C-alpha cells in the first residue's frame, strides 16, 4: 500500500537509488534493513530513496 509523496528533490548517487522530484508519487514503498531509506517504484523502476524527503499517503 503506502505510496509516498516527494517534498524535496534528490539525485540518485548510487546505482540503486532513484532520482525524485517534488510532487511525484512513489508506489509500493517498502522499508529496508538500511535506516533512513525506503524502496519504491517510479517511472517504471524500483530504487532506494531517503525516507526524510517524502511523506506517506493516506
Amino acid at each position: 500500500m503506502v505510496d509516498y509523496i516527494v517534498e524535496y528533490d534528490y539525485d540518485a548517487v548510487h546505482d540503486d537509488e532513484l532520482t525524485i522530484r517534488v510532487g511525484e508519487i512513489i508506489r509500493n514503498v517498502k522499508k529496508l534493513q538500511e535506516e533512513g531509506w525506503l524502496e519504491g517504484e517510479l517511472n517504471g523502476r524500483r530504487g532506494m530513496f531517503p525516507d526524510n524527503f517524502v511523506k506517506e499517503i493516506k
Binding site: 517534498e7 524535496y8 534528490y10 548510487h14 538500511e34 535506516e35 533512513g36 531509506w37 531517503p50 526524510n52 524527503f53
Partner: peptide, 9 residues
Amino acid sequence: GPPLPRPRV
C-alpha cells in the same frame, strides 16, 4: 530544514 540524506551502510 532542506533535508539531508543519511549516509549508506
